[PDB]
Amino acid sequence: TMYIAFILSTIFVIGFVGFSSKPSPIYGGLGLIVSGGVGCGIVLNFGGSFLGLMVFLIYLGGMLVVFGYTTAMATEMYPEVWVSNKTVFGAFVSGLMMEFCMVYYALKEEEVEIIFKFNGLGDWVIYDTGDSGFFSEEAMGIAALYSYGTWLVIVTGWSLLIGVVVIMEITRGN
């Protein structure tokens, strides 16, 4: 077992608690990068190496632009960190306490939330016995974006081009 997936899920939740308590965009981006890397690890354990690396790379590229924008638009004289503000520390501690309560309850018993029912057992238990051979099922399914999924490619490309046009039009000003 080794509980690697559960530990990484907990770190994922902690990073979300950080950037949702929202100290300042610098530390929010730091927490979001940490969460993205840990999510890459989670999906790597579950099987998807390409998907994990892709989400990590995309968020690493995206948080770079956010740093440049918060240096320009969203900065103040004394940027707030988690211990700097009472509201930020309160929200961070509340999120941490809620996550720890859920973790403890799930480990001690089969925790059924008000929304869904969760069973405390092996992520290794839920896995499948069967195997593929001499190809990666995830890689083949993603590569089927071009043979299958011609419609998805069309709508995605149109959306990207229109996004370029839109961001040029919004910032026109005048």
Binding site: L32, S35, G173
Partner: protein, 98 residues
């Protein structure tokens, strides 16, 4: 359901609560909005990899594409607001009233 799905859904709920509770900056809200889609990506790929839905493996990529399209839209609106007011504070977006 395993506890992994519980953690991912809890992270999504935390990010959703972060977006709905503004503090001062619009940029922090955009970061919370980007985290929600990260959690959605992780949840969808965990579900798809577990059931061996081979053709669904392309869905998380489209999810990422429209995620960053939304991020681009938000950054453009943020620069226009900053040009108008000097800061990205949400308090300045008060000219229109209900």
């Amino acid at each position: 359901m395993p506890l992994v799905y519980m953690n991912i859904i809890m992270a999504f709920a935390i990010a959703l609560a972060g977006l709905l509770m503004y503090r001062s900056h619009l940029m922090s809200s955009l970061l919370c909005l980007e985290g929600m889609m990260l959690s959605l990506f992780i949840m969808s790929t965990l579900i798809i990899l577990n059931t061996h839905f081979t053709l669904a493996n392309m869905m998380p990529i489209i999810l990422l594409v429209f995620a960053a399209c939304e991020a681009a839209l938000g950054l453009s609106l943020l620069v226009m607001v900053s040009n108008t007011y000097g800061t990205d504070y949400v308090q300045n977006l008060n000219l229109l009233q209900c």
